[model samples]
Target: GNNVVVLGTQWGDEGKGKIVDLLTERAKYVVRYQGGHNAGHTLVINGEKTVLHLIPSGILRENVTSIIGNGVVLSPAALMKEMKELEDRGIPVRERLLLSEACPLILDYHVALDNAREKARGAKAIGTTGRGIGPAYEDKVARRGLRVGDLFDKETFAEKLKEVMEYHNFQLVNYYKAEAVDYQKVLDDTMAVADILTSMVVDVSDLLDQARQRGDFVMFEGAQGTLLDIDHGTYPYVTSSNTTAGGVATGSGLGPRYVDYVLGILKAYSTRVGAGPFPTELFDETGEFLCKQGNEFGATTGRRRRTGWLDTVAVRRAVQLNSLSGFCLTKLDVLDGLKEVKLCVAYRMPDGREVTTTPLAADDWKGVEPIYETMPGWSESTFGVKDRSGLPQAALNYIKRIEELTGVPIDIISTGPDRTETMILRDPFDA
Candidate 1:
C-alpha cells in the first residue's frame, strides 16, 4: 500500500475535506498532523453538509481510523463539543478516533490572551479566527505548554496550570488591560474534560510504526495551506504551524521517506478570507459574482473572502514546497456563465520587473502587482460531471493550461460540492 499526504495548494478552504473523504476508501488511517481548531474543512455527503475543525475527514468512513497527531494544539472544550455533535448524528466517533498524548493543550487563558491581543492590535490585526490557536502554539514553542498526557495526573496538571495562568494573567491585565482569567474555573473545566479524553489518548508515534510495518495505507491530512505556513508563508500574516508536506513527518512521527505521494487540493479560482497580500484580488463586479456563485465565506469565522484570479505564481511555489505529485482542482463550476476568465501568470514589482515567485515577506507583497493572462470562459454547465470526457472543451482546455503552467498533472477535478461529483484521472493509491 502507499502512504499519501493531502495538502492545500492555495490559502486554505481548497475543499480538502471532500478530497480526503474520497481517498479514505483506500486508506486505513486518516491523520491530522498540524494546526488547531482554527482550520475549517466542510464536507458534503449526499447533500448534507458537515464542517470539521479538529477531526479528520475520514471519521465518516466506517472502517477508517482517525488520529490527531502531536503537532496539533488541542482545545478540550472545542474537541468535546465537536465529538458530542458527531455522536448526536449517529456517528461512532470515540471508537474510531484516536488522539496523540504529546498534543499541547489550549486552555481558557489562551482564549483570553488571544481575544485581548487581537483587540489591542485594532487595524493591525492578523485576522485570526479568534480561536486561541496562535497563543497555544506560542506556548508550545516556548516550552511552557501543557500536553495531553499531563491531564492524567491532577497534581501535575494543577501545578502547570498555576504557572501558565500567572504568566498569562500578568500580560492580560497589565499589557492588554483585560480582566484576569480565573485559575479555578479553567482548572475545573480542564479536569472534567480530561476525564472524558482519558481513554482516547495513545502513543501515536508507536502506533504509526506498527501501521507502516503492516503495510496499512495512511493519509496525512494538512490544515491551512502552504502560503499560510509560519516560516515559508508571508510573515505576520500567516498561520502559526507549518502547513506543508514537510509538516507530515515531524507532526505525525512518520519519516519523510514513508510518505509516497503528496496530493495538492487547489481551487479553480483563488479566494482568501483574512488579511494578506493577494496580488490578483478583484475589486469590481466580477469579485461579487465569484463571491455569490462560489459562496466565498470563511467556514470557521463566517467572514467574506477576498476573490481573485488563479495565481499560478503562488501555486507554483506551493508545488515546490509540498513536492506535489498531482493536483485536485475544485469549484470549476463557479466559473460557468462567465464570458472570460483571467489567470495570473506572474507578478510585477513596483519597479516594473517581472517575477513568477511569491515575495519572501508579507510586507514585500504590498509592492507587487499581478500580471494576468485572459482566456475565454464557457457557458456550458460543468457541474456534477463525474466523467472527464463529459466536460466542455473550454473546461478541458482550462485544465490543460493550468497543468502546463504548474508542471503537474491534474489528476482529479471536483465540479460540484457533493462527494460523488468528481473525476479522478489517476488515483493516488494505485499511482
Candidate 2:
C-alpha cells in the first residue's frame, strides 16, 4: 500500500475535497497536516453536500480513520461544532477521528489578536480568514504556546494561560488599541471543553508510524495551495504555515520516504480568494462568465473569487516545487460553453521578455503580464461525463496542451462536483 499526499496547485479551493473523497475509497486513513479551520473542503456525495472546515474529507467514508496532525492549530469550539453538525446528520465522528496531542490550541485570545491585528492593518491587511490561524502559528513558534495535551492539566493550563494572556493583552491594549480578552471567561470556557477534546487526543506520530508499518494506505491531506505557502508563495500575502509538499513531513510527523505520490489538485482555470499579485486576472466579461458559470466563490469566506485563464507559468512552478507525480484537473465543466478558451503559457515581463517561472519577489510579480495562447472551445457539455473517450476532442486537446505547457501529466479529471463524476487516466496509488 502507498501513502499519498494531495495538495492545491493553485490558490485554495481547487476542488481538493472531492478528489480526496474519491481517493479515500482506496485508503484506510486520511490525515490533515496544516492550517486551521481557515481551510475549507466542500464534498458532495450522492447529492448531499457537506462542507468541512477542521475535519478531514475522509470522515465521510466508512472504515476510514481521519486524523488531525500536529501541524494543525486546533480550535476546540470549531472542531466540536463541525463534529456536532456531522453527528446531527447521522454521521459517526468520535470513533473514527483522532487528534494529535502536540497540536497547538487556538484559544479566544488568538482570535482576538487576529481580529485586532487585521483591523489595525486596515488597507495593508493580508486578507486572512480572521480565524486566528496566523496568531496560533505565531504562538507555536514562540515556544510559549499551549498544546492540546496541556488542556487536561488545569493548574498548568491556568499558569500558561495567564502568562500568554498578559503578553497578548498588553499588545492588544497598547498597540492595537483593542479591548483586552477576559482571562477568567476564556479559561473557564476552554477548560469546560477540554474533556471533550481530550477524549480523541492521541500520539499521532506513533499511530501513523504503526499504521505505515502495517502497510495501511494513508492519505496526508494538505490545506491551502502551494502558491499561498509562507516561504515559497507571494510573501507577506501568504499563510503562516507551509502549504507545499515539504510540509507533509513536518506537519504529519511522518517521514517523506513513506509518501509514494504527491497529487496536485488544480482548477481548470485560475481563481484566487484573497489579496495577491495575480498575473492572469481578468477584469473583463470573460472573468464574469467564468465566475457565474463555475460558481466561483470561496467555500470558507463566501467571498467571490477572481477568475482568469489557466496559468501554466504559475502551475509549472508549483509542479517543480512540490515534485508532483501528476495533477488532478478539476472543474473543467466551468469552461464548457465558451466558443474559445485561453491559457496563460508564460508571463511577459516589463522588459519585453517572456518568462515561465514564478518571480522571486511580490513586487516583481505585480509588474509581469500574462502571455496567453488561445484554443478552440467545445459547445458540447462535459458535465457528469465519466470517460476520456466521451469527452469532446477540443476539451481533450485543452487538457493535453496544459500537460505539455506545465510538463506534468493530468492523471485525473473531475467532471463535476460529485465523487463518482471523475475520469481517471491513472491512479496515484498505482503510479
Candidate 3:
C-alpha cells in the first residue's frame, strides 16, 4: 500500500525529476518502469545540478535502491558512461543500482536500423533520439532480441546475434542503401562489458516482491509523458513503450493493487520537443518570453522546446487514462512578470465543433483551435517562496482554475529547480 507512481501528466518535460528527487527521501526503492536513455531528467539539489538518462532519480539519495525494470531497453556503453559520472561525483553507483536480466539489449544493428528508417522517412520522421530504443523494443516483442541474461551464455549470445544480424544486414544493404553494422565488432564490444553487465543483472520482479513483502515504500518512475504513450498518444509521433500509469504494473511486474497513489507531474505551462501538433503554440514574443524564462530545452537532445499555454484538455485526458490521485504543479515561477496567462479549456475543431476531449491521432489535430480562458498573472517573484499563505492571489487563481477544469487537486508545488523549493500538500507514500 506504500507503493506510488510518479509520471508526467502533459508533454514529457513536466518537471517530474524535481518531484521524484524530493520524494526519494521517503522511498526505499525507486523503479524505472519504461522507456530508455532517450529520457532526460534534470535534477538540481543544494545548488548543484546533474542530468540522468537511464538511471532513476532516486539513485541520488543515499539509501535508495534504484532498479531498472524489464520495461527498459538497455545500451551497456551508455549506461557505463552514466555510471562513471555518478561514481566521479562520489555516489555509490554499483551498490545502489539494479538492472533486470530480462531487459532487451540495444545492439549496434538496432541503431543502424533506426538510422536507416528515420533517414528514409524524410519529413514524416517521428523525431526519435536515433539511439535504437524503438528498434530494440521491436526485437523484444518479435522474440529475436538479446537480454542482459543472454550475456552469461556466450555461445547462445553469438548464435542469436549472427541470426538477427544477417536479417538486419540484408535490409540495411539492399533496401536502405546503408552500410551494414559489423556483427563481430558488436559481439566483441558487448563481450568487453559482459562481466560488469552480468554483475548488475537481477530478477527485478522477484526483488520488488520481496520489498513489497517487507512493506517498504517503492516509487515507480516513468520516463516519458502520458501523451507519449504508444496506445493512447498521437500515432506516428509516440514512443515505442507505454508511457502511461498502466505501464507500472506491466513494466515492473508489480500488481495493480500494490500501487497506492499516482501523482501526475504538471508544468505551469506547456512545452514539446520534436514534431507534433500543438494547438496553443505561440509564435510571438510571449512564447519566446516563456521559453527564456523557463529555460525550455531538452536535457537528452539539447533541442529547444516549442512553448505554449497550458492545455487543460490534455491534462484531463492524462488524469482519465492514468487514474491519477493528484498532480504536482511545477515551474510556477516561470509565469511571473506576465500580464496575463491562458488556459486552453477546450478546442474548436476544423468543422467548427467545440470539443472537450482529445483526438486519437496526430492528424486529428489538424485545424483545431485552442479555446482559451485568460487570467491575470502575478508580478511577484515566487522563485523560492515556500509559504503557501505568501503566494500571489492571481497565481492562486490561475492554479485553482486549472484544478477546477482538470478536476484534480495539486498535491505538490515546485517553485524552483532546487529540491528545497517545494511545498507538499500531501506525500504520495502516505496518500
Task: Put down candidate 3 lDDT per residue, 1-431, tens digits, no spaces.
Answer: 48888899887888876687777889999898898896576655335677778887777787889899888889998999988888877788898888888889998888888888888876453456478988899889999889999999999999999999999999999999999999899999999999998898788878888988888998888888899889998887788889998998888888788888999999999998867878888899999999998988654456679999999988899999989999899999999999988899999988888988988785488778899998888888899888798899999998789889988999899998877888988877877
Question: Pairs clashing in candidate 3?
Answer: none
Write down the TM-score of every candidate.
Answer: 0.93, 0.94, 0.94
For candidate 3, give the lDDT of residue 9. Answer: 89
**Candidates' RMSD to native:** 2.3, 2.3, 2.4
Error of 2 at 137 (Å): 0.7
Off by over 4 Å in 3: 43-50, 123-128, 299-303
For model 2, the run of ten residues with the poorest summed lDDT: 120-129
lDDT of 2 by residue, 172-226 (tens): 9999999999999989999888888999988888888998898788888888889
The TM-score between candidate 2 and the true structure equals 0.94
